[PDB]
Amino acid sequence: HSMINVDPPTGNYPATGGNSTHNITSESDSRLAFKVKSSNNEHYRVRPVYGFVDAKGKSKLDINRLPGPPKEDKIVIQYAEVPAEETDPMAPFKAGAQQGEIIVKLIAA
């Protein structure tokens, strides 16, 4: 199942501004590439957008809440298995190779 987990699986912020760090951890014995789709690229600033997570490893995600209205938004992390050989984290996505997605909720209130 999945093959990636996000810690925490939600980011809860103060409407006027916030922040939270997330741990994307791998469960495959293969390397992964991840793509981050953001719903609100205007109150939220997530980093990186693309990236690798070594096999059975860990990679961080930086979401940054900026002043805005109290509402809920989401981030969808898509992943894909990649040979050690793969340079670009975008290659398996420009390819249509997403193998799964996790939805991180972003509640600003």
Domain boundaries, the chain: 1-109
Question: Degrees (nearest 5) of the Cα angle 42, 47, 49?
Answer: 95
Say if residues 44 and 17 touch (Cβ distance below 8 Å).
no
The resolution in angstroms reads 1.8
Cα maximum dimension of the chain: 44
93 membership: H or E segment, kind and range:
helix 91-94
Homologous superfamily of domain range 1-109: Immunoglobulins (2.60.40.10)
